[PDB]
Amino acid sequence: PDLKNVKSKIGSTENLKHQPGGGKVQIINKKLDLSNVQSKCGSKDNIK
Amino acid sequence: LLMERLSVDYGKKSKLEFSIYPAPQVSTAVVEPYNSILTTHTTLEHSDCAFMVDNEAIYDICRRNLDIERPTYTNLNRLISQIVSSITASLRFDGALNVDLTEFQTNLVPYPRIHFPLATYAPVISAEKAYHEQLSVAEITNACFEPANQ
Protein backbone atom coordinates (compact mmCIF):
# COMPACT_ATOMS: atom_id res chain seq x y z
CA PRO A 1 0.00 0.00 0.00
CA ASP A 2 3.00 2.45 0.19
CA LEU A 3 2.28 5.09 -2.54
CA LYS A 4 5.98 6.33 -2.67
CA ASN A 5 5.19 9.90 -1.46
CA VAL A 6 3.46 11.11 -4.71
CA LYS A 7 4.15 14.75 -5.81
CA SER A 8 1.59 17.49 -6.73
CA LYS A 9 0.45 18.44 -10.26
CA ILE A 10 0.68 21.26 -11.49
CA GLY A 11 1.58 24.36 -9.48
CA SER A 12 2.83 28.00 -9.40
CA THR A 13 6.32 26.66 -10.41
CA GLU A 14 6.85 29.49 -12.95
CA ASN A 15 6.47 32.12 -10.12
CA LEU A 16 9.28 30.80 -7.79
CA LYS A 17 11.77 33.66 -8.70
CA HIS A 18 9.02 36.30 -9.19
CA GLN A 19 8.35 39.44 -7.05
CA PRO A 20 8.28 41.47 -9.40
CA GLY A 21 10.51 44.60 -9.07
CA GLY A 22 9.68 48.19 -10.18
CA GLY A 23 11.16 50.45 -12.91
CA LYS A 24 12.22 54.12 -12.39
CA VAL A 25 11.16 57.67 -13.47
CA GLN A 26 13.01 61.01 -13.05
CA ILE A 27 11.38 64.21 -14.50
CA ILE A 28 13.29 66.75 -14.00
CA ASN A 29 13.59 69.21 -16.92
CA LYS A 30 16.11 71.61 -18.63
CA LYS A 31 16.16 75.44 -18.22
CA LEU A 32 15.30 77.54 -21.29
CA ASP A 33 17.79 80.33 -22.19
CA LEU A 34 16.59 83.97 -21.69
CA SER A 35 20.08 85.62 -22.18
CA ASN A 36 19.03 87.44 -25.43
CA VAL A 37 17.79 90.58 -23.58
CA GLN A 38 18.14 94.35 -23.93
CA SER A 39 15.79 97.26 -23.09
CA LYS A 40 14.81 99.94 -25.71
CA CYS A 41 12.74 102.50 -23.68
CA GLY A 42 15.65 104.92 -22.85
CA SER A 43 18.88 106.49 -24.24
CA LYS A 44 22.47 105.15 -24.73
CA ASP A 45 23.88 107.88 -27.07
CA ASN A 46 21.79 111.12 -26.79
CA ILE A 47 22.42 111.08 -22.96
CA LYS A 48 26.02 112.23 -23.87
CA LEU B 1 -3.58 86.30 -35.14
CA LEU B 2 -5.85 89.20 -36.15
CA MET B 3 -3.69 92.07 -34.74
CA GLU B 4 -1.19 91.12 -37.51
CA ARG B 5 -3.45 90.75 -40.49
CA LEU B 6 -4.86 94.26 -39.69
CA SER B 7 -1.28 95.50 -39.80
CA VAL B 8 -0.60 93.90 -43.15
CA ASP B 9 -3.77 95.34 -44.74
CA TYR B 10 -4.34 98.85 -43.15
CA GLY B 11 -0.74 99.91 -42.61
CA LYS B 12 -0.50 103.13 -40.57
CA LYS B 13 -4.14 103.09 -39.36
CA SER B 14 -4.90 103.10 -35.61
CA LYS B 15 -5.05 99.95 -33.50
CA LEU B 16 -6.37 100.39 -29.98
CA GLU B 17 -7.80 97.54 -27.88
CA PHE B 18 -10.02 96.99 -24.80
CA SER B 19 -8.63 94.10 -22.74
CA ILE B 20 -9.69 92.22 -19.70
CA TYR B 21 -6.23 91.61 -18.10
CA PRO B 22 -5.89 88.71 -15.66
CA ALA B 23 -6.64 88.77 -11.95
CA PRO B 24 -4.19 88.84 -8.96
CA GLN B 25 -5.72 85.98 -6.87
CA VAL B 26 -8.80 84.84 -8.88
CA SER B 27 -8.55 82.62 -12.01
CA THR B 28 -11.18 81.91 -14.70
CA ALA B 29 -8.79 79.35 -16.34
CA VAL B 30 -5.52 77.55 -15.36
CA VAL B 31 -3.33 78.48 -18.37
CA GLU B 32 -4.10 82.25 -18.31
CA PRO B 33 -0.39 83.23 -17.76
CA TYR B 34 0.62 81.29 -20.87
CA ASN B 35 -2.19 82.84 -22.98
CA SER B 36 -1.53 86.39 -21.80
CA ILE B 37 2.22 86.25 -22.40
CA LEU B 38 1.68 84.63 -25.82
CA THR B 39 -0.65 87.41 -26.93
CA THR B 40 1.55 90.10 -25.27
CA HIS B 41 4.61 89.04 -27.39
CA THR B 42 2.33 89.93 -30.37
CA THR B 43 0.70 93.00 -28.72
CA LEU B 44 4.13 94.57 -28.42
CA GLU B 45 4.50 94.22 -32.27
CA HIS B 46 1.06 95.25 -33.65
CA SER B 47 -1.16 97.18 -31.17
CA ASP B 48 -0.53 101.00 -30.99
CA CYS B 49 -1.78 100.98 -27.41
CA ALA B 50 -3.91 98.73 -25.17
CA PHE B 51 -6.46 99.80 -22.54
CA MET B 52 -6.53 97.39 -19.61
CA VAL B 53 -9.29 96.44 -17.06
CA ASP B 54 -9.33 93.67 -14.36
CA ASN B 55 -12.48 91.75 -13.41
CA GLU B 56 -11.16 91.46 -9.80
CA ALA B 57 -11.25 95.28 -9.37
CA ILE B 58 -14.80 95.98 -10.67
CA TYR B 59 -16.09 93.36 -8.26
CA ASP B 60 -14.68 95.48 -5.46
CA ILE B 61 -16.20 98.63 -7.09
CA CYS B 62 -19.43 96.62 -6.93
CA ARG B 63 -18.94 96.05 -3.17
CA ARG B 64 -17.61 99.35 -1.99
CA ASN B 65 -18.45 102.04 -4.54
CA LEU B 66 -21.66 100.80 -6.23
CA ASP B 67 -22.79 98.79 -3.18
CA ILE B 68 -24.68 96.05 -5.01
CA GLU B 69 -24.66 92.69 -3.19
CA ARG B 70 -24.20 90.08 -5.94
CA PRO B 71 -22.46 91.34 -9.04
CA THR B 72 -22.98 89.38 -12.24
CA TYR B 73 -20.86 89.78 -15.46
CA THR B 74 -23.84 91.98 -16.53
CA ASN B 75 -23.66 94.44 -13.59
CA LEU B 76 -19.93 94.42 -14.62
CA ASN B 77 -20.44 94.97 -18.43
CA ARG B 78 -22.94 97.85 -17.89
CA LEU B 79 -20.06 99.25 -15.79
CA ILE B 80 -17.60 98.83 -18.66
CA SER B 81 -20.00 100.53 -21.09
CA GLN B 82 -19.55 103.77 -19.19
CA ILE B 83 -15.76 103.55 -20.04
CA VAL B 84 -16.42 102.95 -23.85
CA SER B 85 -19.06 105.74 -24.10
CA SER B 86 -16.59 108.16 -22.51
CA ILE B 87 -13.70 106.97 -24.68
CA THR B 88 -15.57 107.66 -27.98
CA ALA B 89 -17.52 110.81 -26.96
CA SER B 90 -15.57 113.37 -29.08
CA LEU B 91 -16.29 111.12 -32.14
CA ARG B 92 -20.05 111.18 -31.46
CA PHE B 93 -20.94 114.38 -29.50
CA ASP B 94 -19.87 118.01 -29.61
CA GLY B 95 -17.63 119.42 -26.95
CA ALA B 96 -15.18 122.11 -25.65
CA LEU B 97 -12.12 119.75 -26.02
CA ASN B 98 -11.81 116.94 -28.56
CA VAL B 99 -9.83 113.77 -27.77
CA ASP B 100 -9.39 111.33 -30.64
CA LEU B 101 -8.25 107.73 -31.12
CA THR B 102 -4.93 109.16 -32.35
CA GLU B 103 -4.63 111.53 -29.49
CA PHE B 104 -4.66 108.70 -26.90
CA GLN B 105 -1.67 107.16 -28.73
CA THR B 106 0.43 110.41 -28.83
CA ASN B 107 -0.24 111.32 -25.14
CA LEU B 108 -0.23 107.87 -23.36
CA VAL B 109 2.64 106.18 -25.23
CA PRO B 110 6.22 107.29 -24.56
CA TYR B 111 7.71 104.21 -26.34
CA PRO B 112 5.92 101.70 -28.69
CA ARG B 113 6.43 99.00 -25.93
CA ILE B 114 5.42 101.13 -22.85
CA HIS B 115 1.91 101.12 -24.36
CA PHE B 116 -0.26 99.46 -21.71
CA PRO B 117 -2.41 101.98 -19.81
CA LEU B 118 -5.02 101.21 -17.15
CA ALA B 119 -8.58 102.62 -17.17
CA THR B 120 -10.80 103.87 -14.36
CA TYR B 121 -14.21 105.60 -14.35
CA ALA B 122 -15.99 107.75 -11.71
CA PRO B 123 -18.34 108.33 -10.11
CA VAL B 124 -19.71 104.82 -9.81
CA ILE B 125 -22.26 104.88 -6.93
CA SER B 126 -26.03 104.36 -6.40
CA ALA B 127 -28.66 106.95 -5.40
CA GLU B 128 -28.05 105.85 -1.74
CA LYS B 129 -24.92 108.07 -1.91
CA ALA B 130 -25.56 110.28 -4.92
CA TYR B 131 -28.08 112.29 -2.87
CA HIS B 132 -25.42 112.88 -0.18
CA GLU B 133 -22.43 113.51 -2.37
CA GLN B 134 -22.24 117.03 -4.05
CA LEU B 135 -20.37 115.68 -7.14
CA SER B 136 -18.10 118.55 -8.13
CA VAL B 137 -15.28 118.13 -10.70
CA ALA B 138 -12.62 117.89 -8.08
CA GLU B 139 -14.37 115.15 -6.06
CA ILE B 140 -14.88 113.19 -9.25
CA THR B 141 -11.07 113.69 -10.12
CA ASN B 142 -9.92 112.51 -6.67
CA ALA B 143 -12.27 109.53 -7.25
CA CYS B 144 -10.28 108.28 -10.25
CA PHE B 145 -6.86 108.63 -8.67
CA GLU B 146 -7.79 106.77 -5.45
CA PRO B 147 -6.12 103.32 -5.35
CA ALA B 148 -9.31 101.62 -4.02
CA ASN B 149 -11.17 102.82 -7.16
CA GLN B 150 -8.66 101.60 -9.89
UniProtKB/Swiss-Prot annotation, chain A:
- Give the position(s) of the covalent cross-link described as Glycyl lysine isopeptide (Lys-Gly) (interchain with G-Cter in ubiquitin): 4, 9, 17, 31, 48
Residue stretches spanning the membrane: none
The Tau/MAP repeat boundaries are: 1-24, 25-48
Q: How is it modified after translation?
A: Phosphorylation at serine and threonine residues in S-P or T-P motifs by proline-directed protein kinases (PDPK1, CDK1, CDK5, GSK3, MAPK) (only 2-3 sites per protein in interphase, seven-fold increase in mitosis, and in the form associated with paired helical filaments (PHF-tau)), and at serine residues in K-X-G-S motifs by MAP/microtubule affinity-regulating kinase (MARK1, MARK2, MARK3 or MARK4), causing detachment from microtubules, and their disassembly. Phosphorylation decreases with age. Polyubiquitinated. Requires functional TRAF6 and may provoke SQSTM1-dependent degradation by the proteasome. PHF-tau can be modified by three different forms of polyubiquitination. 'Lys-48'-linked polyubiquitination is the major form, 'Lys-6'-linked and 'Lys-11'-linked polyubiquitination also occur.
Subcellular location field: Cytoplasm, Cytosol; Cell membrane; Cytoplasm, Cytoskeleton; Cell projection, Axon
Q: What does this protein do?
A: Promotes microtubule assembly and stability, and might be involved in the establishment and maintenance of neuronal polarity. The C-terminus binds axonal microtubules while the N-terminus binds neural plasma membrane components, suggesting that tau functions as a linker protein between both. Axonal polarity is predetermined by TAU/MAPT localization (in the neuronal cell) in the domain of the cell body defined by the centrosome. The short isoforms allow plasticity of the cytoskeleton whereas the longer isoforms may preferentially play a role in its stabilization.
Q: Which disease is it linked to?
A: In Alzheimer disease, the neuronal cytoskeleton in the brain is progressively disrupted and replaced by tangles of paired helical filaments (PHF) and straight filaments, mainly composed of hyperphosphorylated forms of TAU (PHF-TAU or AD P-TAU). O-GlcNAcylation is greatly reduced in Alzheimer disease brain cerebral cortex leading to an increase in TAU/MAPT phosphorylations. Frontotemporal dementia 1: A form of dementia characterized by pathologic finding of frontotemporal lobar degeneration, presenile dementia with behavioral changes, deterioration of cognitive capacities and loss of memory. In some cases, parkinsonian symptoms are prominent. Neuropathological changes include frontotemporal atrophy often associated with atrophy of the basal ganglia, substantia nigra, amygdala. In most cases, protein tau deposits are found in glial cells and/or neurons.
What is this protein called in UniProt?
Microtubule-associated protein tau
Q: Specify the species.
A: Homo sapiens (Human)
From Swiss-Prot, chain B:
Which residues are GTP-binding?
28, 32, 55, 73, 77, 101
Q: Which residues are reported to carry the modification Phosphoserine?
A: 81
GO biological process terms, alphabetically, are: microtubule cytoskeleton organization; mitotic cell cycle
UniProt-annotated location(s) = Cytoplasm, Cytoskeleton
Q: Point out residues bearing the modification 3'-nitrotyrosine.
A: 131
Q: How is it modified after translation?
A: Some glutamate residues at the C-terminus are polyglycylated, resulting in polyglycine chains on the gamma-carboxyl group. Glycylation is mainly limited to tubulin incorporated into axonemes (cilia and flagella) whereas glutamylation is prevalent in neuronal cells, centrioles, axonemes, and the mitotic spindle. Both modifications can coexist on the same protein on adjacent residues, and lowering polyglycylation levels increases polyglutamylation, and reciprocally. Cilia and flagella glycylation is required for their stability and maintenance. Flagella glycylation controls sperm motility.
Q: Which GO CC annotations does the UniProt entry carry?
A: cytoplasm; microtubule; microtubule cytoskeleton
In this protein, the active site sits at 103
- Predominant location of this chain? cytoplasm
Q: For this UniProt record, give its keywords in alphabetical order, as a comma-separated list.
A: Acetylation, Cytoplasm, Cytoskeleton, GTP-binding, Hydrolase, Isopeptide bond, Magnesium, Metal-binding, Methylation, Microtubule, Nitration, Nucleotide-binding, Phosphoprotein, Ubl conjugation
This protein's domain notes = The MREC motif mediates interaction with TTC5/STRAP and may be critical for tubulin autoregulation.
Oligomeric form and interacting partners: Heterodimer of alpha- and beta-tubulin. A typical microtubule is a hollow water-filled tube with an outer diameter of 25 nm and an inner diameter of 15 nM. Alpha-beta heterodimers associate head-to-tail to form protofilaments running lengthwise along the microtubule wall with the beta-tubulin subunit facing the microtubule plus end conferring a structural polarity. Microtubules usually have 13 protofilaments but different protofilament numbers can be found in some organisms and specialized cells.
Task performed by this protein: Tubulin is the major constituent of microtubules, protein filaments consisting of alpha- and beta-tubulin heterodimers. Microtubules grow by the addition of GTP-tubulin dimers to the microtubule end, where a stabilizing cap forms. Below the cap, tubulin dimers are in GDP-bound state, owing to GTPase activity of alpha-tubulin.
UniProt similarity note: Belongs to the tubulin family.
Which named protein is this? Tubulin alpha-1B chain
Instruction: Please name the source species.
Output: Sus scrofa (Pig)
